[PDB]
């Protein structure tokens, strides 16, 4: 089952990038409404 | 003064082509430049 | 909003009038300069525009005086002085 | 097809297709300003 | 570059209109080569 | 003065559900595409 | 003689594209307003004839 | 007192409709014409 | 098929050849 | 005939330039007077390398 990992890694690397890029906004934006 | 004059002396001569210049980006039909009515020397 | 305006819609006779004041922006400037004072710009300007609101194109103008300039100063640069002078006086011509 | 322009074959293969980007420019002139 | 923050709205809906007509484009072509062809 | 719109909402993910796999399956029929008996 | 029948159609759009964008940006928007030749008003038949 | 040009608020027609700016314009007429031809 | 490459290079060049016409007139400041 | 690449190969490199150039020059005012000669020193030098390789078709 080695060719699941090779599919899933442009996967992770989408996220990979929503993490870097945008994600200081969004601990802010999950500091709104208090909780 | 001196300067002063002298820019004068460069834009007076200048002037006759910094209205081709000026004219050609607002009018488009016609060679506005050629369309004045400069005022005449005798 | 701005768009270039045809000869042909405008009229010749309502154009003649036109093109003589682009060389009575400069002849004035000219004569500014040479006064060292730039009040007689900064005096026949004042609601020239709300003048020729209804006929001429109130857009046309800055862009036709800004270009004026820029090509103005253009010649002044090989004198290094003067062009920071004349960069003060048709700065006059286009704030009023 | 003759035999001396030839190498061309890529290039004026292409040559009808030009008209309805002639059509398609017109949108994005139009995208550009006035609409 | 930030007059506005990016170039404006026209000029990526060509790009991502292009994008999008390239890969119609693209199943078009796959009708006459590959599995589906009978060639 | 200015407004600060929220990032993610319920449109957030209501637009990505049916666009993440669209452009997946987008290039699943590419694949599929150059690919032959 | 197939080849050069349609060069010579190839050749005569470019001469033919520069009167369309002459004639749409840069040249005169008043056809008529000119030396009393073209233009019109659509509505002197005798002018709309002499197009036909 | 016109000219106003290609607008959608000086002639009365919009982006569509899109050339009836020019039923009365003479010249640009032509130009549509020769680039058509 | 190099032939293939070059007339889809070919094609390439000249679809945005375009609207670099429709640009380049939208930032110089050239009236559209 | 070797010279029958790079006469055309450079008419369809300067035709391309004559796509973008054109609505440029007529598209402004504020270059219209400097850029009108150019057309004619621009399509002039096209029209007789159309004409140059017309002879060139038939010579070889
Ligand atoms: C709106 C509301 C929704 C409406 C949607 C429904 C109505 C529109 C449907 C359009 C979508 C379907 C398009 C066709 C699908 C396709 O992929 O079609 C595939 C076909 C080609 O099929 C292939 O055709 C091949 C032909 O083979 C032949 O040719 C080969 C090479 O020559 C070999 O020689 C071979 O031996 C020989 O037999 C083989 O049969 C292949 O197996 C087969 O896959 O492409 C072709 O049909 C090319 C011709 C295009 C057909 C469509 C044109 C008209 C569409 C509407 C236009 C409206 C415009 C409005 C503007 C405003
Ligand atoms: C006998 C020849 C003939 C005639 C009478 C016409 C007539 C027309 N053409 Mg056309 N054309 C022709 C040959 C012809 N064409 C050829 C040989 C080519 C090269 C392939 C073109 C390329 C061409 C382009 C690129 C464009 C036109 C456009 C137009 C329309 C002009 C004005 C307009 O905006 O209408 C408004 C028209 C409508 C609101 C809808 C009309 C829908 C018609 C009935 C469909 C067919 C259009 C046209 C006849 C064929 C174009 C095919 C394709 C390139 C799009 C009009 C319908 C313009 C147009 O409007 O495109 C649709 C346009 O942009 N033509
Ligand atoms: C439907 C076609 C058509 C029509 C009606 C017009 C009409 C006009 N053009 Mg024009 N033009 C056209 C196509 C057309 N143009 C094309 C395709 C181009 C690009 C080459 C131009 C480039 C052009 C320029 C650069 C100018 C005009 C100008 C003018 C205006 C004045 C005419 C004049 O005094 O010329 C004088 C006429 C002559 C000296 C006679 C020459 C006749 C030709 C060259 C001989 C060949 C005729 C031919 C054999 C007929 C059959 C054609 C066949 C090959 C299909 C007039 C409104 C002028 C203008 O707008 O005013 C400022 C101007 O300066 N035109
Ligand atoms: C001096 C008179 C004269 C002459 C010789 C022509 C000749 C021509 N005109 Mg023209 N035209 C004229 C006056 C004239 N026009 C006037 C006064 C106007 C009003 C401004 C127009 C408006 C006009 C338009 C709007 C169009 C033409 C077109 C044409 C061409 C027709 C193509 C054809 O059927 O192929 C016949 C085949 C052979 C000769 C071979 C041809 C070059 C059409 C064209 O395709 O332009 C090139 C076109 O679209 N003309
Ligand atoms: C010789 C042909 C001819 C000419 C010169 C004109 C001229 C004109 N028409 Mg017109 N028209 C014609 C034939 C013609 N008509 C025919 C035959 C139809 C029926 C289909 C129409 C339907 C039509 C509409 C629907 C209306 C006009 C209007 C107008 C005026 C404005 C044009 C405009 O803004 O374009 C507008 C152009 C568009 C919106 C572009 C649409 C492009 C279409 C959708 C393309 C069609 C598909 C095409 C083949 C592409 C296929 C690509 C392929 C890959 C799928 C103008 C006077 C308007 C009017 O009354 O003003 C006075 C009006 O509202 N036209
Ligand atoms: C056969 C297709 C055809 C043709 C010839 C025209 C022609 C014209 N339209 Mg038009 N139009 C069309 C289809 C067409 N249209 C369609 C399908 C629509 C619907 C989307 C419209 C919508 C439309 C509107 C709403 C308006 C026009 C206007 C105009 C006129 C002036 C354009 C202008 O001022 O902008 C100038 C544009 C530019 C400077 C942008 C640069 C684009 C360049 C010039 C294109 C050509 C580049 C070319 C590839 C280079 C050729 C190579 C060379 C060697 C020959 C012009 C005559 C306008 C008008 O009435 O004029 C006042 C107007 O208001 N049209
Ligand atoms: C970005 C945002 C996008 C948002 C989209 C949201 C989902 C929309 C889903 C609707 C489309 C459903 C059909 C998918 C088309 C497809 O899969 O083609 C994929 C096919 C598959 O292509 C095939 O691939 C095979 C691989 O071996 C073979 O090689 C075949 O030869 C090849 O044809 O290609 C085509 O059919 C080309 C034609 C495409 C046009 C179809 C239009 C259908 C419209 C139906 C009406 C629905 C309304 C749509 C407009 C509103
Ligand atoms: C992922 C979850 C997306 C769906 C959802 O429940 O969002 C709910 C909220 C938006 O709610 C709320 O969304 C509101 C928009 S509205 O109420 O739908 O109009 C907004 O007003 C409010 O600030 C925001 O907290 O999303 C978040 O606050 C956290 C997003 C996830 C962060 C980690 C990744
Ligand atoms: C998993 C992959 C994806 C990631 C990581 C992602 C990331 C993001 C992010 C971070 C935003 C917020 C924009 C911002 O505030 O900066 C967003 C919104 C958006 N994304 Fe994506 N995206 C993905 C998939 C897609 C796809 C496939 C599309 C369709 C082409 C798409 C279209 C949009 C749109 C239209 C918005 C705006 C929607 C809104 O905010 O209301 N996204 N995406
Ligand atoms: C490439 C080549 C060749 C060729 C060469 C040549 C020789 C070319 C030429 C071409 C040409 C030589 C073209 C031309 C064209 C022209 C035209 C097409 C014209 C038109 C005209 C018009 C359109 C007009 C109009 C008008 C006016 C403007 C005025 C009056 C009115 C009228 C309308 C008439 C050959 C085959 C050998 C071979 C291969 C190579
Ligand atoms: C002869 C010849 C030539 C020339 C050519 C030409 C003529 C060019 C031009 C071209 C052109 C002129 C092109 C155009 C294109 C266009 C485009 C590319 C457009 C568009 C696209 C799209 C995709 C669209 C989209 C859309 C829609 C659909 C609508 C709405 C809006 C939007 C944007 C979204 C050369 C020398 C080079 C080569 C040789 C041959
Ligand atoms: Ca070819």
Same mark, same amino acid.
């Given at each position: 089952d080695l060719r699941i990992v090779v599919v899933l890694l442009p996967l992770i690397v989408a996220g990979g990038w929503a993490l870097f890029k945008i994600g200081s906004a969004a601990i802010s934006q999950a500091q709104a409404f208090m909780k | 003064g001196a300067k002063r004059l002298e820019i004068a002396q460069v834009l007076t001569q200048n002037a006759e082509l910094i209205v081709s210049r000026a004219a050609n980006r607002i009018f488009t039909g016609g060679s506005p430049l050629a369309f004045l009515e400069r005022p005449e020397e005798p | 909003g701005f768009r270039p305006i045809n000869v042909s819609r405008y009229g010749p006779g309502n154009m003649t009038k036109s093109l003589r004041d682009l060389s009575w922006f400069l002849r004035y400037t000219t004569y500014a300069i040479v006064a060292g004072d730039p009040n007689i710009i900064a005096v026949n300007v004042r609601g020239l525009r709300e003048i020729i609101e209804n006929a001429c194109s109130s857009a046309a103008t800055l862009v036709a005086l800004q270009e004026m300039r820029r090509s103005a100063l253009g010649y002044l640069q090989?004198?290094?002085?003067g062009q920071e002078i004349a960069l003060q006086y048709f700065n006059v011509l286009i704030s009023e | 097809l003759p035999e001396a322009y030839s190498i061309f074959s890529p290039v004026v293969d292409?040559?009808?297709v030009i008209p309805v980007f002639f059509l398609l420019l017109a949108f994005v002139w139009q995208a550009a300003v006035g609409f | 570059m930030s007059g506005d923050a990016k170039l404006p709205l026209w000029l990526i809906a060509t790009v991502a209109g292009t994008g999008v007509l390239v890969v119609v484009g693209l199943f078009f072509y796959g009708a006459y080569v590959g599995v589906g062809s009978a060639l | 003065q200015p407004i600060t719109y929220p990032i993610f909402t319920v449109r957030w993910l209501a637009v990505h559900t049916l666009a993440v796999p669209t452009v997946f399956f987008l290039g699943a029929i590419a694949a599929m595409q150059f690919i032959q008996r | 003689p197939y080849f050069v029948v349609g060069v010579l159609h190839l050749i005569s759009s470019a001469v033919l594209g520069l009167g369309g964008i002459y004639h749409a940006?840069?040249?005169? *928007?008043?056809? *008529? *307003?000119?030396?009393?030749?073209?233009?019109?008003?659509?509505?002197?038949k005798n002018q709309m004839t002499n197009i036909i | 007192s016109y000219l106003g040009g290609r607008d959608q608020e000086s002639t009365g027609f919009a982006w569509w409709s899109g050339n009836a700016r020019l039923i009365n314009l003479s010249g640009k007429l032509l130009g549509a014409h020769v680039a058509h031809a | 098929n190099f032939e293939l490459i070059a007339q889809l290079l070919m094609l390439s060049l000249i679809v945005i050849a375009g609207p670099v016409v429709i640009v380049l007139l939208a930032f110089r400041g050239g009236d559209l | 005939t070797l010279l029958f690449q790079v006469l055309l190969a450079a008419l369809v490199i300067v035709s391309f330039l004559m796509i973008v150039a054109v609505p440029v020059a007529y598209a402004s005012p504020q270059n219209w007077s400097q850029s009108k000669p150019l057309i004619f020193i621009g399509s002039g030098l096209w029209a007789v390398l159309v004409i140059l390789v017309g002879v060139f078709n038939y010579l070889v």
């Open positions: - | - | 090989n004198d290094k002085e | 292409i040559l009808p | - | - | 940006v840069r040249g005169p *928007e008043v056809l *008529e *307003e000119y030396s009393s030749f073209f233009g019109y008003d659509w509505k002197d | - | - | -």
